[PDB]
A paper describes a structure:
A set of ubiquitylation pathways conjugate ubiquitin moieties on target proteins, which are then recognized and degraded by the 2.5-MDa 26S proteasome holoenzyme. The proteasome is composed of a 28-subunit barrel-shaped core particle (CP) and two 19-subunit regulatory particles (RP)5–8 capped at both sides of the CP. Substrate entry into this chamber for degradation is controlled by the axial channel in the center of a heptameric α-ring, also called the CP gate, positioned on each side of the CP. The globular domains of a substrate are mechanically unfolded by a heterohexameric ring-like subcomplex in the base consisting of six distinct subunits, Rpt1−6, which belong to the ATPases-associated-with-diverse-cellular-activities (AAA) family.
To improve the resolution of the CP structure in the open-gate conformation, we combined the datasets of SD1, SD2, SD3, and another SD-like open-gate class and performed a high-resolution refinement focusing on the CP component, by applying a local mask that retains the CP structure. This allowed us to improve the open-gate CP structure in the SD-like states to an average resolution of 3.5 Å. In contrast to the improved resolution of the CP in the combined SD map, the resolution of the AAA-ATPase module was limited to 5–6 Å in the combined SD map, and was lower than those achieved in the separately refined SD1, SD2, and SD3 maps. In the CP of the three SD states, we observed asymmetrical gate opening. While the α-ring in contact with the RP in the SD states was open in the center, the other α-ring in the opposite side of CP remained mostly closed at the same level of the density contour. However, although the N-terminal tails of α2, α3, and α4 were rotated over a large angle to roughly align along the heptameric axis to open the CP gate, the helical elements connected to the gate-blocking tails in the α-subunits were nearly identical to those in the closed CP. In the current study, the 3.5-Å map of the CP in the combined SD state was substantially improved and thus allowed near-atomic model fitting of the C-terminal tails of the Rpt subunits. Thus, our structural data suggest that insertion of five Rpt C-tails into the α-pockets stabilizes the open-gate state of the CP.
Residue numbers in the entry:
A (entry chain l): 4 to 241
B (entry chain g), D (entry chain m): 5 to 244
C (entry chain h): 3 to 234
E (entry chain i): 2 to 251
F (entry chain k): 8 to 127, 134 to 241
G (entry chain j): 2 to 240
H (entry chain p): 2 to 205
The structure:
């Protein structure tokens, strides 16, 4: 256990435990779900609150005209990588005068997070990214990790009790590719209503949805343009 | 006598020791490798075996004989990374000598610079002291051929019958029993004594495909790596 | 590197610096040497036994000139010794750049001891296990300066450093005196070195440098075998 | 025990446990082999789908460093991404500074020195990567190298990195490697990867095959494996 | 990297300081020095460490360092550790003179050196200067002076100073035999001879074991007298005649 | 030294940030309430000596002409934060001829709430209540040492904040008025403090869209106190 | 620099160095100070000289400008650094805006310096606590104190050093607005507070004042003797 | 010239066993004098002076800088300085401003510290030393003092005729000069003592 101190120390079983600890710290964020169609990439998160009176901590935040990211974990490192993200977008927007393809941006993010996991004197980033974007080959749903082993998927779900949501993604990943936005979004919250305990229901104010489409600029919605999305449901089979 | 953190860093111990460097003098011994140098007359001979159990592994790129400059060769033991890094540093300081001073570097000055860099790594802590040993050979005018050895500690020396690696207490015992009869060394004598001393150490008496022979002579001062055919020629020439 | 920059050498509850005392012990576990200041010259002499019969005595040289008139020997570890030799060389040549005159030995010992003192205090590096014996014939009067790893220095009429240096010192006090010549100093220096060395002592076991007023001189094994072939 | 913490220290018997721990980190990673024919080098990586959540074509471990060079990594993936960026940068420097293609020997030596520099100090950890380097040039032929986590880089004809390090190269060495062009070697690598671990520990894997050589005219890319579909119709004939 | 840090500056588990107290105890096992009350003139006393017979003594100063033209200093502790401070100190005085072309008024000199010492007390985390050292000198604003630096950086202007375990009893003799008004250098030399006669364990006080230097004002000059041996010898004979005078009470 | 500055947990979050959230608790309490009429704000000075002059102790400081503040726990770290936030609002005015709004203020603060770093120093030990009036009316903002900044309707900080938040949730609703909220706040103040409530204990700070200047009440506070 | 923090938080939310290094100030020389309506009075105790030596250099009360006055506790060296720094600072304020320096500005400087000195990378915080007395704005008498954390804190009277609880408890009876507010009685009753020290030798008293328009004046132990005599006279009159 | 911005003339002259250095007293701006007691001859230890001429800024500056380095050396070593060492030091100090040059022509005159050997030398504004045995001159007027010294110098001279020779040379060569005059100071030194005489120069 005395080798279980710092980022630099390898294990005598090879598994550097700081990255495992950062993973488990990412697991204790809010739940979130990101999934794409052939033409529309929708990411759906869930908010929590500190108390009754306070507002909810926001998760789905804007990045650029075709990029919006979800998040889980710490918010300071989140806003730090958000600053870097916006910077890297606007830099190529300045130089090449084109929007960035998503994959090279996520390569830049992984290379950015490579250094603080590699030397001594920095920590890995508690971070929960779900990136949705549009290059010329359409929507992409990427996720990252504090180990920077970023993945491309067709539907991920990270955060608290996200595994049952992944079972839902398994049993409807055939269905996902074909449909339009409405039932896509209600599949998304038909994952999130299983991210919750069954003795309560998903209300308006706690949920947030971000859509980007191949002609649609990335737009965030909260309770007012989500009241149309919350109807069209039945109860859970109690 | 482990006082303070003398098992960990470059500090002085009680009674006068420091363990990090005298742990590095057996950092050569994990190589499983053996090297012999000979200088008796106006030629100078290196010999060192390989150990390749694989058919999938090559044979050309496995050689430890490293042409530093056109007149200076060397051979390495110990672990490979430290050896090759030391090799690039040696080449770099040789080219720097040629640029600054206008003429070819002598093997003496170069080994002294390598030992100085070894001290520089030795001096600060938080720095790993490069567990490889370097033997250099070359011809100098008005002195003939030269043999030098470089320690990890930065203690270089230059001497005739030379051997470092795994088994060289025995090799130096053979060379004390051998370099005492006052015979001359007419270059077949040198090659024959080198191969036979490595043959008395390892007791294998093997093919010409295992040892690499590095030679340099005052007839052609260029460094020269021997070919399979002439190694076989010398081998069957000492086969009686 | 990172530049961690802290020194490992801090004070004891006794007030001592145990790394420096260990470095002095590591010096004392080194090769013997003898240096004697006579009435006209100074004699340096070391004791160099090769580990095998394979080593050559033409490559490594203990006795070392710093200028053409300043000899310098040690008792310790050559890898540190060469470093501070080279430092002293560059330092003396900077002096000769500024003043266009040969640097005096006191000035050498000031500057070298300041550098060594700086290594005793600066960050993380070990001190240098070398005890110098610096000398030279500057302005008629010759000098003899011993230094140490602690950065300090002294001035001896005659001294010794290395194995059984106290025994050599006690022989020096009875045998050596204030006024002799360079030859008699060489004689008693070889006597006190041969008091403590091994039995097989030849023209290659020792290495002797003298300091005339004509300058520093490094003797050859030719004249050593002229002299040390049963000097008494 | 106690010595194994820092990456600058030695052991009481003489090795660095940090580098050893980094070496056996790659042991649990996926199996990645590579073999050269007489006019090209063929890569191959046993890649595994986790359960159902991948896309068959993300995070490809077959990288592509230079116009004629690509990597075949195994171990930690993000560390491999960083290492490949270093190699891309180095080949870019050489192309800029000399105006032609980097030779594979010099490239691998620069990479090996970079790896060694990350093995020296205590400020950084050693890498958890083990990768392949393939080449083809008309004046050079086919060259295949191999880099451990420590930094020892030399040449092969065939190799394997992963669990079945021995278990693949047992029957790699019975392949008639010289007399075959790479178009046979494609289905050879296919049968090698398919033989090791069909269903025992896991449920499903997936094949990628990189492909450099004379048939590509010195280009390096993945095969259109779906063109000529050489695994499966030979895979089902390889279970008997 | 962070399990190799020493304490290096930090306060105790109980409220006190570590390196400062250990620096004081490093001072305590050194040579003995003192200075006297003289209205005209001021003096220093010093004890020879390493009085072995095979030295050269050609430096004319083993503890004294004539630092300005009107100031020297004794010293006690680690030697070249102090030689660094002598170099820097002479440098600071000389750049003062470069800036003004008027000699240094010696208290801001002392504060400059004390700030050098204090800068390694708080941050910098290196081995602190375990050297206390005296000050003699003269000026335009107070005349003859005496000062006592400490590794803390605290400095005291005394009229009769203090070194450690060898000299705590010396300060006891200084208080029990305090003088005032008599600026006579020779009575002060007899006093200092008496003080080192008690405190040093050198039996009957051979002059090879001691060292005295003074600083008198001569007509525009403030010369620094590192006096020779014969007058010390007759001073010792004077003091032992005074011992005979003391045992006239038997 | 017991897993310090730069280490996660086997189960959860960082050590020293959790220790900062613990270190907030010893501070003196404060209560802000957002009303659409304007933001009111209160604090307790915790004065010990009669020598301790009351009006020199600052808790509510003034960031801009329409932005208040409140602090907790430590003092001078909060003073440095106040200084830099003032500088950044003035820079925003300098390059924009307008008012840096309250959220942008708090983002400019929380961008280095966690930039604690000793290599390549310690995290700050103060929780802050921010009140201001943007173009969207009044705002009430609550931040923390960990940078996790949120909007609160009526936040209570520091010591005894559990019962403070509870009994504050008892009386609050959306359509409160100003003076009602003020007296309801000082009720909770004199329920959580230990001394008698008088002219020197607490201080009020009220900002209105029409009363942008003078976010303070001075000795009319005595009249406000005597009405309970 | 040294990448190591001295100021890590506790498990329960404290600092192991700041509130801990206040104990060095607690183990120091005592010094009190009040502000009257026109004359300010302060002074240190515990001269503790060897009764044969000098004390004109061991002076613990100094000035930065002609209008402000100093004091400290703890160890003297950190106080020396802070004093020279603050002299440079107030004279550089004179280089700026041409007012005499307000006391609040210079105390903000001192406390801010000490704070950002505690915040930085591996630096031992100043174990002092100063007392900063001055009357600048129309001669309004003020005194501020510091803290090793760096929290300036305005008072009307003050007690630091050894046994300051006992001194403030003498001040408890000595808080009267009357106190009959002459300059001499204010000075002598501050002298009675400093003579409520744990030893009270009477001659170890070092007191100096300022009349809010003049400069610093050091007293003489014969007027202090008259003050001690009239204090004993009032103690006889109460009987 | 810029050397003729403030006038100035320094003459040194080697006698038999003694050395005489003299300079002019005048200081002022281009056409306007100011004072008659400006210092250009500085004592550098015992039996060894230095003279500086040219721009008075560099005169006082380099005088202070050399005094700085000289006192540093004389405290690092208990002996006093030898004149060749002083010459090398001045050469280094001028050469450090190879492209930022002081506008001065230093003249060094001192005896031997051990014997009664005299020494004279002069430098350039960049540090080119020059040792002679008869005389070295500097300042604005050159050819005047060259002609006079090549007219009046003898090799083996008692201090009296040395004094009279250097006096007549300086007086006539200054009276012919325009921007440099207004009194002359003379330092005539030897092993035994130091004489400083002032001449009744033409104040025109």
């Amino acid at each position: 256990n005395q080798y279980d101190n710092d980022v630099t120390v390898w294990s005598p079983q090879g598994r550097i435990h700081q990255i495992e600890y950062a993973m488990e710290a990412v697991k204790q964020g809010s739940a979130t779900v990101g999934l794409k169609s052939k033409t529309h990439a929708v990411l759906v998160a869930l908010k929590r609150a500190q108390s009754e009176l306070a507002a909810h901590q926001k998760k789905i935040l804007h990045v650029d005209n075709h990029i919006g990211i979800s998040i889980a974990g710490l918010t300071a490192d989140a806003r730090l990588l958000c600053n870097f993200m916006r910077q890297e977008c606007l830099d190529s927007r300045f130089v090449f005068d084109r929007p960035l393809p998503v994959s090279r941006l996520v390569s830049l993010i992984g290379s950015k997070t490579q250094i603080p996991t590699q030397r001594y004197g920095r920590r890995p980033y508690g971070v929960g990214l779900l990136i949705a974007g549009y290059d010329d080959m359409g929507p992409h749903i990427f996720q990252t990790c504090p180990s920077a082993n970023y993945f491309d998927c067709r539907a991920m779900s990270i955060g608290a009790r996200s595994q049952s949501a992944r079972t839902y993604l398994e049993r409807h990943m055939s269905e996902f590719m074909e449909c339009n936005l409405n039932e896509l979004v209600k599949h998304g919250l038909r994952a999130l209503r299983e991210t919750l305990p069954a003795e309560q229901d998903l209300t308006t104010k706690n949920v947030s949805i971000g859509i980007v489409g191949k002609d649609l600029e990335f737009t965030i919605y909260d309770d007012d343009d989500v009241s149309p999305f919350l109807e069209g449901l039945e109860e859970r089979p109690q | 006598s482990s006082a303070g953190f003398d098992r960990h860093i470059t500090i002085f111990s009680p009674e006068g020791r420091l363990y990090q460097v005298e742990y590095a003098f057996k950092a050569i011994n994990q190589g499983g490798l053996t090297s012999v140098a000979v200088r008796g007359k106006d030629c100078a001979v290196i010999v060192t075996q390989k150990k390749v159990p694989d058919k999938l592994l090559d044979s050309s790129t496995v050689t430890h004989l490293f042409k530093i400059t056109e007149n200076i060769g060397c051979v390495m033991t110990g672990m490979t990374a430290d050896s090759r890094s030391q090799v690039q540093r040696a080449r770099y300081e040789a080219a720097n000598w040629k640029y600054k001073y206008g003429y070819e570097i002598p093997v003496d000055m170069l080994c002294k610079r390598i030992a100085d860099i070894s001290q520089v790594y030795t001096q600060n802590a938080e720095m790993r002291p490069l567990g490889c040993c370097m033997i250099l050979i070359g011809i100098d005018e008005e002195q003939g051929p030269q043999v030098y050895k470089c320690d990890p500690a930065g203690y270089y020396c230059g001497f005739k019958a030379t051997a470092a690696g795994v088994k060289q207490t025995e090799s130096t015992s053979f060379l004390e029993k051998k370099v005492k009869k006052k015979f001359d060394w007419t270059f077949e004598q040198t090659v024959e004594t080198a191969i036979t001393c490595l043959s008395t150490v390892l007791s294998i008496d093997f093919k010409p495909s295992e040892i690499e022979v590095g030679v340099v002579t005052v007839e052609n001062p260029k460094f020269r790596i021997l070919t399979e055919a002439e190694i076989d020629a010398h081998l069957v020439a000492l086969a009686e | 590197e990172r530049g961690y920059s802290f020194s490992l050498t801090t004070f004891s509850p006794s007030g001592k610096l145990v790394q420096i005392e260990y470095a002095l012990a590591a010096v004392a576990g080194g090769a013997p040497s003898v240096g004697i200041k006579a009435a006209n010259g100074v004699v340096l002499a070391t004791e160099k036994k090769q580990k095998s019969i394979l080593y050559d005595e033409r490559s490594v040289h203990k006795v070392e000139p710093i200028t053409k008139h300043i000899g310098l020997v040690y008792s310790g570890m050559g890898p540190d010794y060469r470093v501070l030799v080279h430092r002293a060389r560059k330092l003396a040549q900077q002096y000769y750049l500024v003043y266009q005159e040969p640097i005096p030995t006191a000035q050498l010992v000031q500057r070298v001891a300041s550098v060594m003192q700086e290594y005793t205090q600066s960050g993380g590096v070990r001190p240098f296990g070398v005890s110098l014996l610096i000398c030279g014939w500057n302005e008629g009067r010759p000098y003899l300066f011993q230094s140490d790893p602690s950065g300090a220095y002294f001035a001896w009429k005659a001294t010794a450093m290395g194995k059984n240096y106290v025994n050599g010192k006690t022989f020096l006090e009875k045998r050596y005196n204030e006024d002799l010549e360079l030859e008699d100093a060489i004689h008693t220096a070889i006597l006190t070195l041969k008091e403590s060395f091994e039995g097989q002592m030849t023209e290659d076991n020792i290495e002797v440098g003298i300091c005339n007023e004509a300058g520093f001189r490094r003797l050859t094994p030719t004249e050593v075998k002229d002299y040390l072939a049963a000097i008494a | 025990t106690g010595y194994d913490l820092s990456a600058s220290t030695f052991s009481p018997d003489g090795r660095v446990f940090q580098v050893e721990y980094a070496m056996k980190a790659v042991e649990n990673s996926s199996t990645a082999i590579g073999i050269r024919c007489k006019d090209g080098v063929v890569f191959g990586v046993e890649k595994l789908v986790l359960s159902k959540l991948y896309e068959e074509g993300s995070n490809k471990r077959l990288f592509n460093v230079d116009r004629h060079v690509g990597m075949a990594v195994a171990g930690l993936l993000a560390d491999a991404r960083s290492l490949a960026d270093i190699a891309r940068e180095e080949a870019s420097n050489f192309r800029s500074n000399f105006g032609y293609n980097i030779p594979l020997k010099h490239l691998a030596d620069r990479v090996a020195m970079y790896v060694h520099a990350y093995t020296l100090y205590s400020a950084v950890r050693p890498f958890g990567c083990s990768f392949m380097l393939g080449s083809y040039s008309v004046n050079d032929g086919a060259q295949l190298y191999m880099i451990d986590p420590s930094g020892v880089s030399y040449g092969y004809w065939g190799c394997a990195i992963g669990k079945a390090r021995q278990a693949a190269k047992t029957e790699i060495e019975k392949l008639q490697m010289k007399e075959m062009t790479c178009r046979d070697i494609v289905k050879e690598v296919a049968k090698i990867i398919y033989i090791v671990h069909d269903e025992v520990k896991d449920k499903a894997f997936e094949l990628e095959l990189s492909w450099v050589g004379e048939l590509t005219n010195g280009r390096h890319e993945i095969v259109p494996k779906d063109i000529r579909e050489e695994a499966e119709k030979y895979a089902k004939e390889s279970l008997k | 990297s962070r399990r190799y840090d020493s304490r290096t500056t930090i306060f105790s588990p109980e409220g006190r300081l570590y390196q400062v107290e250990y620096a004081m105890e490093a001072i305590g096992h050194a040579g003995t020095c003192l200075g006297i009350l003289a209205n005209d003139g001021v003096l220093l006393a010093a004890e020879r460490r390493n009085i072995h017979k095979l030295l050269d003594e050609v430096f004319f100063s083993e503890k004294i360092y004539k630092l300005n033209e009107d100031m020297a200093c004794s010293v006690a502790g680690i030697t070249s550790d102090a030689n660094v401070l002598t170099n820097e100190l002479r440098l600071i005085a000389q750049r003062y003179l470069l800036q003004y072309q008027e000699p240094i008024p010696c208290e801001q000199l002392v504060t400059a050196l004390c700030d050098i010492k204090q800068a390694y007390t708080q941050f910098g985390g290196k081995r602190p200067f375990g050297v206390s050292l005296l000050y003699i000198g003269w000026d335009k604003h107070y005349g003859f002076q005496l000062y006592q630096s400490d590794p803390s950086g605290n400095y005291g202007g005394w009229k009769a100073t203090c070194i450690g375990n060898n000299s705590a009893a010396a300060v006891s003799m200084l208080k029990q035999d305090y003088k005032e008004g008599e600026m006579t250098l020779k009575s002060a030399l007899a006093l200092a001879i008496k003080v080192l006669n008690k405190t040093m364990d050198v039996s009957k006080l051979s002059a090879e074991k001691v060292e005295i230097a003074t600083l008198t004002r001569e007509n525009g000059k403030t010369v620094i007298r590192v006096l020779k041996q014969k007058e010390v010898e007759q001073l010792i004979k004077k003091h032992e005649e005074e011992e005979a005078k003391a045992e006239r009470e038997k | 030294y017991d897993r310090g500055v730069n280490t996660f947990s086997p189960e959860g979050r960082l050590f020293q940030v959790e220790y900062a959230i613990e270190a907030i608790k010893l501070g003196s309490t404060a209560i802000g309430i957002q009303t659409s009429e304007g933001v009111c704000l209160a604090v307790e000075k915790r004065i010990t000596s009669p020598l301790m002059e009351p009006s020199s102790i600052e808790k509510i400081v003034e960031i801009d002409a329409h932005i208040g503040c409140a602090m907790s726990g430590l003092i001078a770290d909060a003073k440095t934060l106040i200084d830099k936030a003032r500088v950044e609002t003035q820079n925003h005015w300098f390059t924009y001829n307008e008012t840096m709004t309250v959220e942008s203020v708090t983002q400019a603060v929380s961008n280095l709430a966690l930039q604690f770093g000793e290599e390549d120093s310690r995290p700050f030990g103060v929780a802050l209540l921010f009140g201001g009036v943007d173009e969207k009316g009044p705002q009430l903002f609550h931040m923390d040492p960990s940078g996790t900044f949120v909007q609160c309707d009526a936040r209570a900080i520091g010591s005894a904040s559990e019962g403070a938040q509870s009994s504050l949730q008892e009386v609050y609703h959306k359509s409160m008025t100003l003076k009602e909220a003020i007296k309801s706040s000082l009720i909770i103040l004199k329920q959580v403090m230990e001394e008698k409530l008088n002219a020197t204990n607490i201080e009020l700070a009220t900002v209105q869209p029409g009363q942008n200047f003078h976010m303070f009440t001075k000795e009319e506070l005595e009249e406000v106190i005597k009405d309970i | 620099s040294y990448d190591r923090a001295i100021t890590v938080f506790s498990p329960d939310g404290h600092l192991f160095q700041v509130e801990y290094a206040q104990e060095a100030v607690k183990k120091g020389s005592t010094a009190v100070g009040v502000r009257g309506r026109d004359i300010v009075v302060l002074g240190v105790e515990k001269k503790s000289v060897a009764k044969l030596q000098d004390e004109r250099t061991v002076r613990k009360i100094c000035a930065l400008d002609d209008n402000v006055c100093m004091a400290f506790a703890g160890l003297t060296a950190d106080a020396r650094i802070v004093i020279n720094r603050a002299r440079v600072e107030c004279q550089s304020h004179r280089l700026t805006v041409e007012d005499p320096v307000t006391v609040e500005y210079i105390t903000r400087y001192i406390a801010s310096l000490k704070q950002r000195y505690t915040q930085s990378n591996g630096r031992r915080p100043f174990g002092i606590s100063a007392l900063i007395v001055g009357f600048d704005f129309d001669g309004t008498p003020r005194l501020y104190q510091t803290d090793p954390s760096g929290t300036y804190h305005a008072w009307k009277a003050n007690a630091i050093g050894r046994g300051a609880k006992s001194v403030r408890e003498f001040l408890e009876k000595n808080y009267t607005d009357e106190a009959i507010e002459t300059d001499d009685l204010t000075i002598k009753l501050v002298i009675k507070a400093l003579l409520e020290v744990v030893q009270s030798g009477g001659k170890n008293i070092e007191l100096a004042v300022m009349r809010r328009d003049q400069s610093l004046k050091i007293l003489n132990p014969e007027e202090i003797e008259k003050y001690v005599a009239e204090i004993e006279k009032e103690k006889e009159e109460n009987e | 010239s810029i050397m003729s911005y403030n006038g100035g003339a320094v003459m040194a002259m080697k006698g038999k066993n003694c050395v005489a250095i003299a300079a002019d007293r005048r200081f002022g701006i281009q056409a306007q004098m100011v004072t008659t007691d400006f210092q250009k001859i500085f004592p550098m230890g015992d039996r060894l002076y230095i003279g500086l001429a040219g721009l008075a800024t560099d005169v006082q500056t380099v005088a202070q800088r050399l005094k700085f380095r000289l006192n540093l050396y004389e405290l690092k070593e208990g002996r006093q300085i030898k004149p060749y060492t002083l010459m090398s030091m001045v050469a280094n100090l001028l050469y450090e401003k190879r492209f930022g040059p002081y506008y001065t022509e230093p003249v060094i005159a001192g005896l031997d510290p051990k014997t009664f050997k005299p020494f004279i030398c002069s430098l350039d504004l960049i540090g080119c030393p020059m040792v002679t045995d008869d005389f070295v001159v500097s300042g604005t007027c050159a050819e005047q003092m060259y002609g006079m010294c090549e007219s009046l110098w003898e090799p083996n001279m008692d201090p009296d005729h040395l004094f009279e020779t250097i006096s007549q040379a300086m007086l006539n060569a200054v009276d012919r000069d325009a921007v440099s005059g207004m009194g002359v100071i003379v330092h005539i030194i030897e092993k035994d003592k130091i004489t400083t005489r002032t001449l009744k120069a033409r104040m025109d």
